[PDB]
Amino acid sequence: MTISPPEREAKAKVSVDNNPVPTSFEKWGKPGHFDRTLARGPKTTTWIWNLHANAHDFDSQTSDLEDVSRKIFSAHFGHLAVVFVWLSGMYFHGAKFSNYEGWLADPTHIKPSAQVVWPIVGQGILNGDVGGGFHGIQITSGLFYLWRASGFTDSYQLYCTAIGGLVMAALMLFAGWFHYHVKAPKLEWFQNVESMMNHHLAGLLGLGSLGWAGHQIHVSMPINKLLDAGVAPKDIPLPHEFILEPSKMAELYPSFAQGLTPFFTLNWGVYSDFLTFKGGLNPVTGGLWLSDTAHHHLAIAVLFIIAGHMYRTNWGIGHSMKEILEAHKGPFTGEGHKGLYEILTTSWHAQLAINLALLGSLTIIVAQHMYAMPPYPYQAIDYATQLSLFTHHMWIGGFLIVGAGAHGAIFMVRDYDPAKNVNNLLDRMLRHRDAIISHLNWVCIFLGFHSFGLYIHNDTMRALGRPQDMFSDTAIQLQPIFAQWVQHLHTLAPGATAPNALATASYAFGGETIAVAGKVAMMPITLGTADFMVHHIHAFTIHVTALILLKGVLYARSSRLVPDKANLGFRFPCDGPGRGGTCQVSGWDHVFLGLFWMYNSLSIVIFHFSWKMQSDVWGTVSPDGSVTHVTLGNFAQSAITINGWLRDFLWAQAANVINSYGSALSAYGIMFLAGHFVFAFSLMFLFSGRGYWQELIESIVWAHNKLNVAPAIQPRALSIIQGRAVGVAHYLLGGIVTTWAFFLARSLSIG
Amino acid sequence: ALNRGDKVRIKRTESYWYGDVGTVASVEKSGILYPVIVRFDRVNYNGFSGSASGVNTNNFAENELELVQ
Amino acid sequence: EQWIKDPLNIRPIAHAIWDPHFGEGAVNAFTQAGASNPVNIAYSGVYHWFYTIGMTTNQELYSGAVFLLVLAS
Amino acid sequence: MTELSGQPPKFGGSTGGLLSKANREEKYAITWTSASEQVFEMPTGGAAIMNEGENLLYLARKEQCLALGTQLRTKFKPKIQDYKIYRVYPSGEVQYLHPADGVFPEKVNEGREAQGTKTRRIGQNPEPVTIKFSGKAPYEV
Amino acid sequence: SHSVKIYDTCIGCTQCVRACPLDVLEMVPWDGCKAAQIASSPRTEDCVGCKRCETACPTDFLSIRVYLGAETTRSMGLAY
Amino acid sequence: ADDFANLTPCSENPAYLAKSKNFLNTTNDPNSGKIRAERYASALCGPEGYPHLIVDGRFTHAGDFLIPSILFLYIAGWIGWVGRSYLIEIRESKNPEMQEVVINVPLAIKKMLGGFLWPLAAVGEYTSGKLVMKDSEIPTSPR
Amino acid sequence: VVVAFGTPEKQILIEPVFAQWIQATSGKALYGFDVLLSNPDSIASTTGAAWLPGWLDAINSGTNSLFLTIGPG
Amino acid sequence: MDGLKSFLSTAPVMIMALLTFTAGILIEFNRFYPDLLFHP
Ligand code: CLA
Ligand code: CLA
Ligand code: CLA
Ligand code: CLA
Ligand code: CLA
Ligand code: CLA
Ligand code: CLA
Ligand SMILES: CCCCCCCCCCCCCCCC(=O)OC[C@H](COP(=O)(O)OC[C@@H](O)CO)OC(=O)CCCCCCCCCCCCCCC
Ligand SMILES: CC1=C(/C=C/C(C)=C/C=C/C(C)=C\C=C\C=C(C)\C=C\C=C(C)\C=C\C2=C[C@@H](C)[C@H](O)CC2(C)C)C(C)(C)C[C@@H](O)C1
Ligand SMILES: CC1=C(/C=C/C(C)=C\C=C\C(C)=C/C=C/C=C(C)/C=C/C=C(C)/C=C/C2=C(C)C(=O)CCC2(C)C)C(C)(C)CCC1
Ligand SMILES: CC1=C(C/C=C(\C)CCC[C@H](C)CCC[C@H](C)CCCC(C)C)C(=O)c2ccccc2C1=O
Ligand code: SF4
Ligand code: SF4
Ligand SMILES: [Cl-]
C-alpha cells in the first residue's frame, strides 16, 4: 500500500492490479535476488558475471507473462527517463558551455563548440580556438544546426528546455515506479494491439508531426525567414510575438491575412507562400527549405492520423488484424499468416525482433536521407558533422539489426510452439531452411568472388604494368547504368513526373552545384566503375551478415548435427568436441559472428562515404564557378584497387590523426591509439579458450593460499560464452573508436 | 576410524581437494570401496559452462583421508 | 663478376625473372641492376659471402654447385 | 525385425530428412503408439502430426530417433514410452536397437554384462611411458 | 569409435545414462556403491563424443571417461 | 669526474632553455610553465632538451626514483595488508562470500585505518607464523 | 599523453645506465664512465693485448654498428 | 532501511566511491602542485 488514487478509467479496456509489488529497499542489498540460481550468494567469481548477464532476462526470472510485461513496461519508462536526462544535458551544455549565440550571429566564420575542458595536467589544450574568442571542443552532433532550424536565439531558451527535460525525466521515472508498484496493468491490457496501433499511428506519430508542423509554421519559419534575410538575432521578435502580433506573420506570409477560413473550405492554395513544394535547398544555409519541411510534416500528420483508424477497438468499425492475417494464404504457402497474430501477441521476443530489424533499417535510411537532403541550416558545409552523423546512424542501425537476429533466435528457442505453427509461413520456413541457406551461401560466394575478386584482379593487373586489363572507367568498364538512369529520372522529374515541384528532391541525383560560403553543400554525385564495385561489396557484406543471422534463427531448434539444440537453449557454448566438434552452433554464437560481419559491412560503407564525398562532392568553389574537391577527384582511379584504399585513403588521410599531437586534436590521436590497443586486446579473448586460463588461475590461487590470502569467492576463468562476448565487445569498441578518431581528425582538418 | 565432524585432508592426488581440508558427514558400511563422505567449503569445478558454483561433497576411502581436526 | 668490380654501387642479382603475366611496365621496372632482362636483386648477402670466401668467377660458383649436386647424391 | 508396422506421421515434407546415406549406407526407424492424433516437433525441422494408434517414422541418424523419443516421453501430458528404435540396412536387415533389452538403460536391469568397466581409479592409470610403443593407451590397459 | 570407460568411483547415480543422447551407456548391477549399480558402455559404436555424461558426473573427477578415437560416420554425427 | 658525459644539466643545455622559455601552462596558473622550467632546470637533459632520469641508485638523483619508490611501496603494502586482513577476518563469519560481495563497511574501515603499521605487522606475522603457510597444507595439482 | 598535450618535457625518460656502463667496460668512452677498458689506467687495458687498439678504434667510432649508442627509447 | 545501507555497501558502489575519492585526491594535488616529474 503506497499512494491510492481514485481509479482513472472511462469505459476503458484499462485493467490493473492495485499494489502487487510493495516499494522496499531490502532487495537492493540482496544482489542477484531476481535469479534463483543466484539468490543464495556467490561461491565462485562466475556468480558475479551472471548477475550482470541475466539482469534484464525477464523470461528467465519468471514464467508469468503478465509479470514479464509489467517489468518491461516500467523498464521502458526508466529508459525514457534516461534519454530525457541525456537530452536535457545536451540542451544545458548548449545553454551554459557553448558559443551558440556567437555562432548564430555569424555561422560561416565560427566553429560550433559546446564542451569546455578544465585546465589540468595539460589537457586544457583541448580547448581549441573555435572563433569569436571561444575556446572549447568542436562538436559534430549538429546540435547548433537543429537549434537554429527550431528557432532558438538565446541561452535562456535552451536552459528552459533543459529544465523541461529534467522534469520530463522525473515524470517518466515516477510513471515507471507507479505502473510497476502501484497500478500494474494486466496482460489483457498489453495485448490490445489494435488499439495500441491506432494510438501510435494517429496519436504518437500523427499528432507528433502535427504539433511540429505547428511549431515550424509559427516559430521556426518566420524566425529563420528573418535570420536568412540578414537580420541580427537580437532584432528578431521572440517566438510568442508572432502569435500575439499576427500582423508580423501576415507581413512575412500574406496568406495569414486570410486566416483559417481557406483551411476549412479546402482552399489550401492560398497558403502557397508558407506551405511549399520548392525542393532543392535553401541558398543561404544549404539546408532544406523549412517551409517544405512544414508542409511535409503537415501531410505526414494527415497520413498518420488517417492510418490510425484502420483497426477495430470498441466500436465495430475497423479491422481485426487476426482476420486480415488469416485471409492471406496461397497455393505456395499453406495456411499463410495463420498463427502470426497469436505469436506477435504472446511473444515479446518476436515483436522485438521485428522492431529491431525495422528500427535499424530506419536508422540507416535516416543517415542516407540526411546526408544528401541536408535538413538543417549549415550542416552540409560542416563536413565533420555530415560524416559523423552519417556514420553514427549507420552504426546504430547495424547494431539494432544484429539484435533483431538475436531475438528471432530467442523466439525460436523459448516461445515457438510447434502445436501453434502447423503448415503456416514459419513452419514452411523451418521445413526448407536447407534450400534457403544453401542458396544464400552460394549467393554470398558469388557476390564475394565478383566484387572483392574484381579488386584483386585490378591490383594484380596494375602491379603487372597492365592498366588496360583493369576494371576501370578508362579500361574494362563496369558502368552502373540503372543507377545513372534513375538519377536522370530524378533530374527530369521537376518538369514532368513532379510538376508542382520546382527543384530536385536532392542535387546528388544531378543538377546545380549548391555552395554556401566558399564550400559546396551538395552537387551531383556521379556513379562509375569504382562505385559499381563498392556497391557490390556492400551487397556482398550485407548478404553474408544476413546469411549468418538467418542461419542462426532457422537452426536454433535443431540441425542434422544437433537435433535437440532447442533443449540446449539460446545461449550455450557448444555440445562438446564430439561429432567432429560442435562449437558455436547456438543462436547466440551466430549473433556473435554476425556482429563481426556487420562491423565489416559498415566499416566499408562509411569508408566509401568518406572517400567518395571527399573526392567527388565536398570541396571549395572559386568565385569563377569551378569546384576543387578535398581529395582532388582521386576516387575513380584509386578506389578500384585495395592498394588504392590502403595508400590514397587510409595512409593519406591518416596524416591528420597521427600529427594531432601538440594541438587541440591531440585527444583524437590518443583515442586512435586507444582503439588500436583495444582491438589488439580483444584478440587474446577471441583466439584462446578458458581451460588455459583456469590452469593459470590455479597456479595464482596457489600463490595466494601460500600467504593465506585466497578469497572465499573462488576465481574462475571466464565462461566460453563470456570469452566470446568480451572478445567481440572489445573488437567492436576498439575498431569503431579507431575509425571515429580517424574520421574526426580528418573531417575537422579539411576546411 | 572416521566420525562425523572429523576434519580431514584429501590425498587422492587426482581429486580437486588434494591438500585442502573437508569435514566428514557420514561413514558408509563395509563392503563399499569409498564409504567416507566429505563436505567442503570450496566447491569444485563441476558444472556446465557458466554454472554459478560446483559440487562440494565427495566420497573417499580411509586411506585417502588424513585426520587433522 | 660485375659486382666484384664495384660492390658498393652495383646491386647483386639473385636470379632471372620469367613470368608471362608481366606487362611492359613491370618488364622495364625489373630490368635493373644493369641487366638486359627482368631480374630480382638478391638480399641474402650471398655475393659478399662468396667474395670474402675467395671466389671470383661464375666458373667457381658453378663448380661448387655441381659439387653440391654430387654431395647431395 | 519381422516387418515394421505403423502409419507415417502426417507431414507435408521438408528438406531436412533423409539423404543418399539412407539408401547407400543406413537409416533408422522409430515406432510408437499415441492415444491421440497430436502435434509433435520433427527433429529435422517443423511440426508433424502423429496418428492415433501406431506410428512409424524414418530418420537419418540414431540421435534424431533418440531426440524424438525424449520429446515423446517428456513433452506430452500422458507420456509416450513405448517407442522403439531400429537400425535399417539397404539389404532390408532391421536391427532392433532401443530399448536394448526391453528396459530403458537409465535403470538397472538384471542380465546386463558390464562393458568398459575398470577395477581402479582414474588416478590409478599407468604412466604412458610404461606402455609406449604398444598399441594401448593408459585407459585401454 | 570413441572409448568410454567407467572406473570404480562410480556411485551409480544413473546421470551418465540419463544424459547420453545416443544410448551408449547402461545401468548394470554392481556392488561397489550403495546403489548396487554401475554404468556400462556396450554401444560405443554409436558414441559421438559430446561429453554430456562427464558433464553430468558428480564424483571428484569423473567416474566415466570418454576418449575420442577413430572417427566414423556415426561418431562424426553425420546425417549424410 | 666526467661521468654521464652524454648528458648536460638542463640549465646548461641551450635546447632545453629555448624550449623552457615556451613551456605551456598545465593549469590555470599563468606561471605553471615558468615554474616547470625552473623546476626541471635542475635535472640532467639530453641533446633534444628534455630531462633524463638517473635511477642507478645514486642519492644525488634519489628524487628520480628512490623517493617515489619508497612512497609507492608504503602505500601498496598498506592497501594489500589491510585487504588481506579484512579477507582473513571475514572467514570466521560463517558466510564470508557475502561480506566479500557486500562489504562490512565498519569492519573494513577499522582495518583500513590500522594499515600505517603494516611493516611491523608483516614482520610479526612472519615471525609468529601467520603470514606464510606450509607447502603440505596447500592444495596442489597432480605432477 | 604528456607529449600529446604539448609538454614533451614531462616524459619519464630513464637513462639506460647499466648497458651504457657495460659498453664503457669495452672501451666505449662516449658516456664518460671510464671503467675497465674505457679507463687507460686500468689493468685490463695495460695488458699488451694485440687486439686492444683495433677493438678500441672500432668501438669508439660512431660509424659502425659496434655497440650502438643508446638512450631512453 | 537496512536494504539501502547494504546496497550502498556493495562492491561496485564501494569501489566507485573509493575511485572517485582517489581521483579527487590526485586531481587536486596536481592542481595545486603540478608537473612533479621527480623529487627536487
Ligand atoms: C526508490 C523507489 C523504488 C523502490 C525502493 C523500489 C523497489 C523495488 N523494485 Mg522498483 N521501480 C522504481 C522504483 C523503486 N523500486 C522505478 C523508478 C521504476 C521504473 C524504472 C521501477 C520499476 C521496477 C521493475 C520493473 C522492477 C522493480 C523491482 C523492485 C524490487 C527489486 C529492486 C532490486 O532489484 O534492487 C535494486 C536495483 C537497482 C537500484 C538498479 C540499479 C540502477 C540501474 C542499474 C540503473 C538506473 C536506472 C534507473 C531505474 C533510471 C535512471 C535514473 C535517471 C535519473 C538516469 C524492489 C522491492 C523488480 C522486482 O519486482 O523484483 C522482482 C522489478 O522487476 N522496480
Ligand atoms: C546527460 C549527460 C551529461 C554528460 C556526459 C555531461 C558531461 C559533463 N558535464 Mg554536464 N550536465 C548534465 C549532463 C551531462 N553532462 C545535466 C543534465 C546537467 C544539469 C544538472 C548538467 C550540468 C552541468 C554543469 C553545471 C557542469 C557540467 C559539467 C560537465 C563536464 C564535467 C564533468 C564532471 O567533472 O563531473 C564532476 C564529478 C562529480 C560531481 C563526482 C561524481 C560522483 C560519482 C557519481 C561518484 C560515484 C560513486 C557514488 C557512490 C555514487 C553512486 C550512486 C549511489 C546512489 C550508489 C562533463 C564533460 C561541468 C562543465 O561543463 O565544466 C566546465 C559543469 O560545471 N554539467
Ligand atoms: C495518443 C496516445 C499514446 C501515445 C502518445 C503513446 C506513446 C508512447 N507509448 Mg503508448 N499506449 C497507448 C497510447 C499512446 N502511447 C495505449 C492506448 C496503449 C494501450 C494499448 C499503449 C500501450 C503502450 C505500451 C505497452 C508501451 C507504450 C509505449 C509508448 C512510448 C514508446 C514510443 C516512444 O518512446 O516514442 C517517443 C517518446 C516520447 C515522445 C516521450 C513523450 C512521452 C510522454 C509521457 C507522452 C506525453 C503525451 C501526452 C498525450 C500529452 C500531450 C498533450 C500536450 C502536451 C500536447 C511512447 C511515448 C512503450 C513505452 O515506452 O512504455 C513507457 C510501451 O512499452 N504504449
Ligand atoms: C498542433 C499545431 C498547431 C497549433 C496548436 C496551432 C495554433 C494556432 N494557429 Mg496554426 N497552423 C497549423 C497548426 C497549428 N496551429 C497548421 C498545420 C497550419 C497549416 C494549415 C496552420 C496555419 C495557421 C494559420 C494561417 C493561422 C494559424 C493560426 C493559429 C492561432 C489561432 C488559431 C486558433 O487556434 O483559433 C481557434 C480556431 C477556431 C475557433 C476555428 C473555428 C473557425 C472555423 C469556421 C470552424 C470550422 C470547424 C468545423 C468543425 C469544420 C467544418 C467547416 C465546414 C462545415 C465549412 C493558434 C495559436 C492563426 C493565427 O493566429 O496566426 C498567427 C492563423 O491565421 N495557423
Ligand atoms: C530495444 C533493444 C533490445 C532489447 C531491450 C534487448 C533485450 C534483451 N537482450 Mg538483446 N540485443 C540488442 C537489443 C536489445 N536487447 C542488440 C542491439 C544486440 C546486438 C548487440 C542484442 C544482442 C543480444 C544478445 C547476444 C543477447 C541479448 C540478450 C537480451 C536479454 C538480456 C539483457 C542483458 O544482457 O542484460 C544485461 C546487459 C549487459 C550486461 C550489457 C553489458 C555489456 C555491454 C555490451 C557493454 C557496452 C559498452 C558500452 C556501450 C561502451 C563502452 C563503455 C565502457 C568503456 C565503460 C534482454 C531481454 C541476452 C539473452 O540471453 O537474451 C535472453 C543475450 O544473450 N541481446
Ligand atoms: C580477409 C579475411 C577473410 C577472408 C578472405 C574470408 C573469406 C570468406 N569468408 Mg570469412 N571471416 C573472417 C575473415 C575472412 N573471411 C573473420 C575474421 C571472421 C570472424 C568473424 C570471419 C567469419 C566468417 C563467417 C561466419 C562466414 C564467413 C564467410 C566467408 C566466405 C564468404 C563467401 C565468399 O566470399 O566467397 C568467395 C571468396 C573470396 C572472395 C575470397 C577471396 C578469393 C580470391 C579473391 C580469389 C582466389 C584466387 C585463387 C583461388 C588463388 C588460388 C591459388 C592457387 C595456387 C591454388 C569467404 C570465402 C561466410 C561464408 O562462408 O559464406 C558462404 C560465412 O558465413 N566468414
Ligand atoms: C603506470 C606508470 C606511471 C607512472 C610511473 C607515472 C608517473 C607520473 N606521472 Mg603519469 N600517466 C600514466 C602512468 C604513469 N605515470 C598513464 C597511463 C597516463 C595516461 C592516463 C598518465 C598521464 C599523466 C599525466 C597527464 C601526467 C602524469 C604525471 C606524472 C608524474 C606526477 C607525479 C605526481 O603527481 O607527483 C606526486 C604525487 C603525490 C605524492 C600524490 C599521491 C597521493 C598520495 C598517496 C597522498 C597521500 C599522502 C600519504 C600520507 C603519503 C605521504 C608520505 C607518508 C609516508 C607520510 C609522475 C612522475 C603528471 C606530471 O606532472 O608529469 C610529470 C601529469 O601531468 N601522468
Ligand atoms: C534489382 C531487381 C531486379 C532483378 C530481378 C531479380 C529477380 C528476383 C526473383 C524475383 C522475386 C521472387 C519472389 C517473389 C515470388 C513470390 O513471392 O511468389 C509468391 C509465392 C507465395 O504466394 P502465395 O500465393 O502463397 O501468397 C500467399 C501469401 O499471403 C503468403 O501466405 O512465394 C513463394 O512461393 C515463396 C518462394 C520465395 C522464394 C523466391 C525468393 C528467392 C530469393 C531471391 C529474390 C531476389 C529479389 C531481389 C529484389 C530486391
Ligand atoms: C608484506 C606484504 C606481503 C608479502 C610480502 C612477501 C611475502 C614478499 C616476498 C618477497 C620475496 C620472497 C622475495 C623478494 C625478493 C626481492 C628482490 C630480489 C629485490 C631485488 C631488487 C633489486 C636488486 C633492486 C635494485 C634497485 C636498487 C635501487 C637497489 C636502484 O635505484 C635501482 C635498482 C633497480 C638497481 C603481502 C602481499 C602478503 C601483503 C602486502 O601488502 C605486503
Ligand atoms: C694426403 C694428406 C695431406 C694432403 C692433402 C691434400 C693434398 C689436400 C687436402 C685437401 C683436404 C684435406 C680438404 C679439402 C677440402 C675442401 C672441401 C671440404 C670443400 C668443401 C666445400 C663445402 C663443404 C661446401 C662449400 C660450399 C660451396 C661448394 C660453394 O661453392 C659455396 C660455399 C659453400 C656452400 C660452403 C697432407 C699431406 C696435408 C696431410 C696427410 C694427408
Ligand atoms: C584473459 C582471458 C581470460 C582471463 C580473464 C579474466 C579472468 C577476467 C579478469 C577480469 C578482471 C578480474 C576484472 C577487470 C575488468 C573490470 C570488469 C573493469 C572494472 C573497472 C572498474 C573498477 C572501474 C579468460 O577467462 C578467458 C576465457 C575464455 C576465452 C578467453 C579468455 C581470456 O582471454
Ligand atoms: S573447444 Fe570449447 S566450445 Fe569447442 S567443443 Fe570444445 S569445449 Fe566446446
Ligand atoms: S557415470 Fe558418474 S555420474 Fe553417471 S551414473 Fe556413473 S557414477 Fe553417476
Ligand atoms: Cl593502386
What phi, psi does D33 have (nearest 5°)?
-105, 140
Q: What is the C-alpha separation between B42 and A714, in angstroms, rounded?
A: 8
Ligand 6 — pocket residues by CB below 6 A?
Answer: A 441, 444-445, 448-449, 452-453, 456, 544, 547-548, 593, 596
- Stretch (H or E) spanning G14: none
Q: Do D16 and A560 touch (CB under 8 A)?
A: yes
Give distance in angstroms: CA of A385 to centre of ligand 10.
Answer: 76
> β-strands E3-6, A627-629: how paired?
unpaired
Q: Give me the sign of the Cα torsion angle E59, E63, E68, E72.
A: negative
Mutate to test the interface with A, among F97, F103, F136, F141 (most CBs of A within 10 A): F97
Q: What is the C-alpha separation between G50 and G27, in angstroms, rounded?
A: 15
Q: Do F55 and G17 touch (CB under 8 A)?
A: yes
- What is the residue with the minimal CA distance to atom 27 of ligand 6? A544
C-alpha distance from residue A89 to each of A84, A97, A288, D50, E38 (Å): 8, 11, 27, 61, 67
Query: Strand ranges (DSSP E) for A269-364?
Result: none
Residue D75: CB atoms within 10 Å: 13
Half-sphere exposure of A49 (CA within 13 A, CB side): 19
- Nine-digit cell string for A145: 544546426
A743: burial class by Cβ within 10 Å (0-12, 13-18, 19+)?
buried
Q: Which chains touch G (3 or more CB pairs under 8 A)?
A: A, F, H
A501: burial class by Cβ within 10 Å (0-12, 13-18, 19+)?
middle
- Nine-digit cell string for A300: 505526414
Q: What is the C-alpha separation between D70 and D65, in angstroms, rounded?
A: 9
Q: Which residue of D has its CA nearest to E19?
A: D106
Helices and strands (DSSP H and E) totals, chain A? 33, 8
Residues 6+ apart with CB under 8 A from H28: none
A714 in Cβ contact with A44 (< 8 Å): yes
Residue A658: CB atoms within 10 Å: 13
- Nine-digit cell string for D40: 509433435
Chains F and A touch (3+ CB pairs under 8 A): yes
- Nine-digit cell string for A159: 536552459
Q: Which of F60, F74, F118 to mutate to test the pocket of ligand 9 (most atoms within 8 A of CB)?
A: F118
Dihedral of the CA atoms A225, A228, A233, A239 (nearest 10)? Answer: 20
Q: What is the C-alpha separation between A20 and A721, in angstroms, rounded?
A: 36
Q: What is the C-alpha separation between A283 and A512, in angstroms, rounded?
A: 11
F-chain residues near B20 (CB < 8 A): 139
| Closest in F24, F52, F56 to G13, CB measured | F52
By C-alpha distance, which of E1, E27, A578, E56 is closest to D100? E27
A619 in Cβ contact with A603 (< 8 Å): no
H37 in Cβ contact with F51 (< 8 Å): yes
Q: Is A44 on the interface with B (CB under 8 A)?
A: yes
Under DSSP, is residue A397 helix (H, G, I), strand (E, B) or coil? helix
A660 in Cβ contact with A669 (< 8 Å): yes
C-alpha angle A430-A434-A437 in degrees, rounded to nearest 5:
100
Q: What is the C-alpha separation between A190 and C37, in angstroms, rounded?
A: 81
By C-alpha distance, which of A286, A287, A258 is closest to A272? A258
By C-alpha distance, which of F49, H33, G7, G11 is closest to A122? G7
B4 in Cβ contact with B16 (< 8 Å): no
By C-alpha distance, which of G61, G67, G64 is closest to G16? G67
- What is the residue with the minimal CA distance to atom 19 of ligand 2? A89
Under DSSP, is residue B27 helix (H, G, I), strand (E, B) or coil? strand
- Stretch (H or E) spanning D41: strand D38-41
Residue C19: CB atoms within 10 Å: 10
Is E24 near ligand 13, meaning CB less than 6 Å away? no
G-chain residues near A672 (CB < 8 A): none
A277 in Cβ contact with A292 (< 8 Å): yes
Give distance in angstroms: CA of A387 to centre of ligand 13.
Answer: 61
Q: What is the C-alpha separation between A383 and A521, in angstroms, rounded?
A: 9
Q: Which DSSP symbol is given to A643?
A: H
> β-strands E37-40, D94-98: how paired?
unpaired
Residues in chain A: 751
D92 alpha-carbon distance from chain centroid: 18
Q: Is D73 on the interface with A (CB under 8 A)?
A: no
Q: Which DSSP symbol is given to F115?
A: G
- What is the residue with the minimal CA distance to atom 61 of ligand 3? A76
- Nine-digit cell string for A309: 483508424
C-alpha distance from residue B1 to each of B30, B31, E33 (Å): 12, 15, 19
E16: burial class by Cβ within 10 Å (0-12, 13-18, 19+)?
buried
Could you give the number of structural domains in chain E? 1
The greatest distance separating any two alpha carbons of chain E, rounded to the nearest whole angstrom, comes to: 44
Q: Which residue of H has its CA nearest to G10?
A: H37
B35 in Cβ contact with B59 (< 8 Å): yes
- Nine-digit cell string for C46: 650471398
A493 in Cβ contact with A358 (< 8 Å): no
Q: What is the C-alpha separation between A281 and A522, in angstroms, rounded?
A: 9
Q: What is the C-alpha separation between A10 and A14, in angstroms, rounded?
A: 9
Q: Identify the experimental approach.
A: X-ray
Instruction: Characterize H14-33 residue by residue with b for buried, 16 or more Cβ atoms within 10 angstroms of its Cβ, and e for exposed.
Output: eeeeeeeeeeeeeeeebbee
Taken in order of first residue, the domains within chain H and their CATH numbers are 1-40 (1.20.5.510)
By C-alpha distance, which of G70, G72, G73 is closest to G31? G70
Q: Which atom of ligand 12 is the closest one to the Cα of A582?
A: 5
What phi, psi does A392 have (nearest 5°)?
-60, -50
Q: Do F102 and A43 touch (CB under 8 A)?
A: no
Q: What is the C-alpha separation between A416 and A434, in angstroms, rounded?
A: 19
C-alpha distance from residue F80 to each of A247, F113, F130, G16 (Å): 76, 13, 15, 31
Q: Do G12 and H35 touch (CB under 8 A)?
A: no
Q: What is the C-alpha separation between E59 and B45, in angstroms, rounded?
A: 11
- Stretch (H or E) spanning E66: strand E64-67
A149 alpha-carbon distance from chain centroid: 22
A93 in Cβ contact with A115 (< 8 Å): yes
Question: Cell 494486466, residue?
Answer: A186
Q: What is the C-alpha separation between A470 and A457, in angstroms, rounded?
A: 7
Q: What is the DSSP string of A175-238?
A: HHHIIIIIEEEPHHHHT-HHHHHHIIIIIIIIHHHHHHHHHIIIIIHHHHHHHHTT--TTTSPP
C-alpha angle D81-D85-D88 in degrees, rounded to nearest 5:
165
Q: What is the C-alpha separation between B18 and A16, in angstroms, rounded?
A: 58
Chains C and G touch (3+ CB pairs under 8 A): no
Q: Which DSSP symbol is given to E67?
A: E
Q: Which atom of ligand 9 is the closest one to the Cα of F57?
A: 31
Q: Which DSSP symbol is given to D21?
A: H
Helices (H), A415-527: 425-431, 433-449, 452-463, 481-492
Residues 6+ apart with CB under 8 A from A129: A135, A664
Q: Is G10 on the interface with A (CB under 8 A)?
A: yes
Mutate to test the interface with A, among F23, F87, F126 (most CBs of A within 10 A): F87
A311 in Cβ contact with A197 (< 8 Å): yes
Q: Is H12 on the interface with A (CB under 8 A)?
A: no
CATH number at residue E14: 3.30.70.20
C-alpha distance from residue A529 to each of A165, A203, A477, A485, A649 (Å): 49, 47, 6, 15, 17
Domain chopping of chain B, boundaries:
1-69
A58 in Cβ contact with A70 (< 8 Å): no
E10 is in an annotated binding site: yes
- Nine-digit cell string for A559: 540441425
Q: Give me the sign of the Cα torsion angle A301, A306, A312, A316.
A: positive
Q: Give me the sign of the Cα torsion angle A96, A97, A101, A104.
A: negative
A-chain residues near B48 (CB < 8 A): 572
Q: Which CATH architecture has domain B1-69?
A: Roll (2.30)
Q: What is the C-alpha separation between E12 and D75, in angstroms, rounded?
A: 26
Give distance in angstroms: CA of A89 to centre of ligand 2.
Answer: 9
C-alpha distance from residue A639 to each of A58, A87, A89, A611 (Å): 48, 39, 41, 9
Q: Which atom of ligand 7 is the closest one to the Cα of H30?
A: 34
Q: What is the C-alpha separation between F13 and F21, in angstroms, rounded?
A: 13
Q: What is the C-alpha separation between D83 and E20, in angstroms, rounded?
A: 17
Residues 6+ apart with CB under 8 A from A162: A88, A89, A91, A92, A95
Under DSSP, is residue A579 helix (H, G, I), strand (E, B) or coil? coil
C-alpha distance from residue F35 to each of A124, A286, D92, E22, F23 (Å): 17, 50, 98, 79, 9
B22 in Cβ contact with B38 (< 8 Å): yes
- Nine-digit cell string for G37: 677498458
Q: What is the DSSP string of D26-47?
A: -EEEEEEEESS-EEEE-TTSSE
Q: Which CATH class is domain F1-143?
A: mainly alpha
Q: Give me the sign of the Cα torsion angle A205, A72, A594, A562.
A: negative
Query: Strand ranges (DSSP E) for D44-137?
Result: 47-50, 53-59, 84-88, 94-98
- Nine-digit cell string for A316: 465495430
Q: Which DSSP symbol is given to A134?
A: E
- Nine-digit cell string for D53: 494408434
Half-sphere exposure of A520 (CA within 13 A, CB side): 25
Question: Cell 560446483, residue?
Answer: B54
Give helix A529-554 / helix A433-449 axis angle, nearest 10°: 160
Residues in chain H: 40
- Nine-digit cell string for A611: 572517400
- What is the residue with the minimal CA distance to atom 19 of ligand 5? A403
> β-strands D27-34, D84-88: how paired?
antiparallel
Q: What is the C-alpha separation between A227 and A106, in angstroms, rounded?
A: 11
Q: Is A34 on the interface with B (CB under 8 A)?
A: no
Distance from the Cα of D127 to chain A's closest Cα (Å) equals 22
Query: Strand ranges (DSSP E) for A454-597?
Result: 514-516, 519-522
- Nine-digit cell string for A35: 535469479
Could you give the number of structural domains in chain A? 1
- Domain limits for position A373: 1-751
Q: Do G34 and F36 touch (CB under 8 A)?
A: no
Q: What is the C-alpha separation between A111 and E21, in angstroms, rounded?
A: 67
- Domain limits for position E49: 1-80
F122: burial class by Cβ within 10 Å (0-12, 13-18, 19+)?
middle
F133 in Cβ contact with A708 (< 8 Å): yes
F72 in Cβ contact with F41 (< 8 Å): no
- Nine-digit cell string for D31: 515406432
Which residues face A319 on adjacent strands? A311
- Nine-digit cell string for D32: 510408437
Q: What is the C-alpha separation between F33 and F26, in angstroms, rounded?
A: 7
The greatest distance separating any two alpha carbons of chain C, rounded to the nearest whole angstrom, comes to: 42
> β-strands A134-136, A128-131: how paired?
antiparallel
Distance from the Cα of E55 to chain B's closest Cα (Å) equals 6
- Stretch (H or E) spanning A517: none
Q: Do F91 and A712 touch (CB under 8 A)?
A: yes
E50 is in an annotated binding site: yes
C-alpha distance from residue A188 to each of A13, A184, H40 (Å): 8, 12, 75
Q: Is the peptide bond before D99 cis (omega within 30 degrees of 0)?
A: yes
D43 in Cβ contact with D83 (< 8 Å): no
Q: Which chains touch A (3 or more CB pairs under 8 A)?
A: B, C, D, E, F, G, H
Q: Indicate the fold that domain D1-141 takes in CATH.
A: Photosystem 1 Reaction Centre Subunit Ii; Chain: D; (3.30.1470)
C-alpha angle A585-A588-A590 in degrees, rounded to nearest 5:
60
Residue F132: CB atoms within 10 Å: 11
Q: How many beta-carbon pairs below 8 A join chains A and G?
A: 24
- Nine-digit cell string for F66: 628512490
C-alpha distance from residue F102 to each of A48, F44, F93, F110, H6 (Å): 12, 50, 13, 16, 7
Q: Give me the sign of the Cα torsion angle D18, D23, D28, D34.
A: positive
D20: burial class by Cβ within 10 Å (0-12, 13-18, 19+)?
exposed
D74: burial class by Cβ within 10 Å (0-12, 13-18, 19+)?
exposed
Q: Is F101 on the interface with A (CB under 8 A)?
A: yes
Q: Which chains touch E (3 or more CB pairs under 8 A)?
A: A, B, D
- Stretch (H or E) spanning D36: none
